[PDB]
Write a protein that binds this ligand. Sequence first.
Ligand SMILES: C[S@@+](CC[C@H](N)C(=O)[O-])C[C@H]1O[C@@H](n2cnc3c(N)ncnc32)[C@H](O)[C@@H]1O
Lengths: 6, 242
Amino acid sequence: SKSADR
Amino acid sequence: GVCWIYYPDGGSLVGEVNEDGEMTGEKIAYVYPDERTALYGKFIDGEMIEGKLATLMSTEEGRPHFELMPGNSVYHFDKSTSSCISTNALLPDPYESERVYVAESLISSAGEGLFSKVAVGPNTVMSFYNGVRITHQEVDSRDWALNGNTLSLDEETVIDVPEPYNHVSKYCASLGHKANHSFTPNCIYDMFVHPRFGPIKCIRTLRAVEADEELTVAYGYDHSPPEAPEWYQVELKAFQAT
Ligand SMILES: C[S@@+](CC[C@H](N)C(=O)[O-])C[C@H]1O[C@@H](n2cnc3c(N)ncnc32)[C@H](O)[C@@H]1O
């Protein structure tokens, strides 16, 4: 969720 | 009997393997994806114990012949933990140092950005995104203000470059956290297995880029859970409009 490129 | 073992990202380990099948010896090298820049020296079962910066000058019957660069650059395997980004935060990666530099972004109010030093072709690894290794629970439970640099690695791990390491005066071992977001990007994030950093992500070009071009990647936040910082949410609307 609160991170890039999941 | 020399062997080469390639990772999917195009880096490799090369050397004579030992009595078992193992990359262990004093003359083993990791060769970066340019197939020219190398870290050469002592490895044990493929882990870099002491790699010296070298250039791969030729191969003869498959055997690589290196020249060591001047200086005393020695690198070793030094995977981050949840609390330690690097044993040598100020020692730059020598491949990245030839390819990228940090300057003010061309995107208005986006702080610093990552730029190409040199013209390159498509599919070129430019920069590495190393950082501390924390859980999705920690990142997802906490405010966006703390999550400017969080990059998902896999289902278990998020890589972060927390303050003050987001300043190049405190941390410059890698620079991937300096690339800004675009919905029309020239690069992607991609998996990378690095001999110093371990399993991380890199910034890889999608297309040819010119010298001094800003490198950008799509950050890829969830648009329909948008779960994203305000500046991105703005930018999404504008993108969808075009
Ligand atoms: C991974 S860092 C990128 C490097 C950062 N600009 C710096 O100076 O260290 C992420 C931060 O850059 C900024 N940023 C990235 N892309 C942006 C954009 N398209 N518009 C505005 N701000 C952006 C946001 O402040 C975000 O928290």
